[PDB]
């Protein structure tokens, strides 16, 4: 689960559930006097064919969808969470932030460096008052009360 979180960031529960179910069914097969080597070979073949079928048939290209695809993906990911119902606004905020932190690299590959979005928490008003700062937010204050608290340019 930790590795799935690190490399993808989503589906950390589905991976655990699928792994446990695979292990349970494989143990049932072994108890049916099927050698574990055959079960492992079959599992490898099945995983390879599942990946191939997914990449061949079930994928949907997002080029013809647009920003609505990103909004829907964010809303789907935010379901089952404390901010699930407020997805209509949270997904817009997420998409705006990700598009804001967008940068390009060599070979013309648009790379989106998440963890550059500084997430600040502060209890108080409702979740609808969560702010998307068009800049950067620091968890720091001025060193002394003498200095002004607002600089224009």
């Amino acid at each position: 689960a930790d590795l799935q979180d690190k490399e993808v960031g989503d589906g950390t529960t589905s991976v655990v559930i699928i792994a446990a179910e695979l292990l349970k069914n494989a143990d049932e097969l072994v108890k049916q006097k099927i050698h574990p080597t055959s079960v492992i070979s079959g599992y490898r073949l099945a995983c390879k064919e599942a990946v191939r079928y997914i990449n061949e048939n079930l994928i949907v290209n997002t080029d013809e969808l647009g920003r609505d695809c990103l909004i829907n993906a964010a809303k789907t990911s935010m379901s089952s969470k404390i901010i699930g119902i407020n997805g209509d606004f949270f997904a817009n905020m997420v998409v705006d932030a990700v598009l804001a932190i967008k940068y390009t690299d060599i070979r013309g590959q648009p790379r989106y460096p998440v963890n550059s979005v500084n997430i600040l928490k502060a209890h108080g008003r409702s979740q609808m008052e969560s702010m998307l700062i068009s800049g950067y937010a620091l968890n720091c204050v001025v060193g002394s009360q003498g200095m002004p608290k607002r600089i224009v340019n």
Partner: protein, 144 residues
């Protein structure tokens, strides 16, 4: 009775709740809610606790039946939006230039505390302190 030997007389919700040590995490959540309300606006600390308790009771009423909590949460959020709309609808403006209106507002705020015996003095003290602490530098307004 403070654990270090002090004595606390109060009817403030946050002052009472901060002195209670609990083991159930739900009580910890409620105490944190009380502290949030106290820090954000400084008033209505017992009201938020009472409202949360009542809403959770009426939610348990449906949880006893076969209604999933997600439906209850969706209804609660719709209700919260409608409450905000109605509260803004029934609100009235205040002319902050009027000292009498501000004093009356502070009075209605402190009618429920022990200082209500000396209401005019406390209201004048609070209003004068807030007025003279008001600052505006570099196009930024603050109270602090």
């Amino acid at each position: 009775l403070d654990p270090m030997g002090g004595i606390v007389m109060t009817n403030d919700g946050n002052a009472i709740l901060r002195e209670i040590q609990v083991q159930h995490p739900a009580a910890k959540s409620m105490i944190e809610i009380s502290r949030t309300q106290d820090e954000e606006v400084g008033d209505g600390t017992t009201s938020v606790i009472i409202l949360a308790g009542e809403m959770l009771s009426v939610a348990e009423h449906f949880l006893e039946q076969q209604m999933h909590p997600t439906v209850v949460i969706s209804a609660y959020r719709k209700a919260l939006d409608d409450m905000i709309s109605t509260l803004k609808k029934i609100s009235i403006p205040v002319d902050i230039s009027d000292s009498d209106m501000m004093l009356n507002i502070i009075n209605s705020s402190i009618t429920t505390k022990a200082i209500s015996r000396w209401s005019s003095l406390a209201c004048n003290i609070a209003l004068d302190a807030v007025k003279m602490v008001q600052f505006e530098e570099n196009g930024r307004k603050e109270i602090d």
